[PDB]
């Protein structure tokens, strides 16, 4: 094609992310009259999301996904998006990104500093905790070998609840669980399904601890080369795909505990009061480390009412 473009992702071929990216690719191909074709590179073929962001920056990858929280790698205050229990729901995550001074400035920096244009934002689920033994209360976390991604906020989740974290890439998790090299992991329900972690985890606990969004990102090196009518095709398709993406996650969060129970997983509902209590020292550390910019981002986000209006 005129524009042979590539979209990399950690998510696999059985995921909502992939299905939404397929929708995006199809609409772009159609509405561009075949000028643009977007090929997909799932399951961390191209590296992880840190690597794929670097490839968007240098122009060697055209599209990828990232959470708003992942920009904590560059702007420490952006960890606010994944401080456990801070962002209440997706309504808050949307307004945090688009309708705060903090979020608007973040978007501008992503463009200026990181070489990426934000096309759209979707919901990517609320993280829960699976394990090889029941989590009936916070006590059960103590010393649980809890896999986390290579992200400071998830490592802190594990530390502050009393678990023993083991960081590793998404691709490595299934084997780690299967072999009981670790005792558990944490991810939204849809990823537990997509990755078939339910095959290798007997328990799932509704810890509700981190709220993931998902940004459709394009390399500025690519976006600038598309004539404006094709930029519009891409942007509009990313917006349409993000709405679909969100819906996939919303619908699964109603349908998936019963799916897992039919697969033999035991579901628990530990009291979250002490989980939330355990994060208070972590918030204080975040404020100490990130200074006024972190205190301001918190304040801006804590001011957002979570009820749709
Ligand atoms: C956009 C993206 O790649 N998301 C991935 C996230 C983030 O890397 C992580 O939350 C840090 O931001 O990690 C996973 O949940 C994980 O490894 O368990 C896989 C998921 O596909």
Residue numbers in the entry: 1 to 309
Paper text:
We attempted to crystallize the wild-type protein with this non-cognate sialylamide ligand and were able to collect data to atomic resolution of 1.05 Å where ab initio phasing was applied to remove any model bias. Strikingly, the ligand appeared to be coordinated exactly as Neu5Ac, including the positioning of all waters in the binding pocket, and careful refinement of the structure revealed that the bound species was in fact Neu5Ac, based on analysis of H-bonding patterns (interaction with waters), B-factors of the carboxylate, and also considering expected bond lengths for unrestrained refinement of oxygen and nitrogen atoms. Mass spectrometry data confirmed the presence of trace amounts of Neu5Ac in the sialylamide sample despite purification after synthesis using silica and ion-exchange chromatography and checked by one-dimensional 1H NMR. The finding that the wild-type protein was able to selectively bind this minor contaminating component, while R147E protein exposed to the same stock crystallized with the bound sialylamide, confirms the important role of the Arg-147 residue in the selectivity of SiaP for its cognate ligand. Crystallization of the wild-type SiaP with the same preparation of sialylamide revealed that the arginine is able to “fish out” even the minimal amounts of Neu5Ac present in this sialylamide preparation, analogous to conditions of limited environmental nutrients. These data also suggest that sialylamide probably is not a true ligand for wild-type SiaP, and binding detected in Muller et al. was likely due to this low level of contamination with Neu5Ac. Binding of N-acetylneuraminic acid (Neu5Ac) to C-terminally hexahistidine-tagged wild-type SiaP-His6 yielded a KD of 0.14 ± 0.04 μm, in close agreement with published data for native or N-terminally His-tagged versions.
Tripartite ATP-independent periplasmic (TRAP) transporters are secondary transporters that have evolved an obligate dependence on a substrate-binding protein (SBP) to confer unidirectional transport. We investigated the significance of this interaction using the sialic acid-specific SBP, SiaP, from the Haemophilus influenzae virulence-related SiaPQM TRAP transporter. The first structure of a TRAP SBP revealed that the charge of the carboxylate group of the ligand, sialic acid, was neutralized by an arginine residue, Arg-147, in SiaP, which sequence analysis had revealed to be the most highly conserved residue, being present in 98% of TRAP SBPs of the common DctP family. Using in vitro, in vivo, and structural methods applied to SiaP, we demonstrate that the coordination of the acidic ligand moiety of sialic acid by the conserved arginine (Arg-147) is essential for the function of the transporter as a high affinity scavenging system.
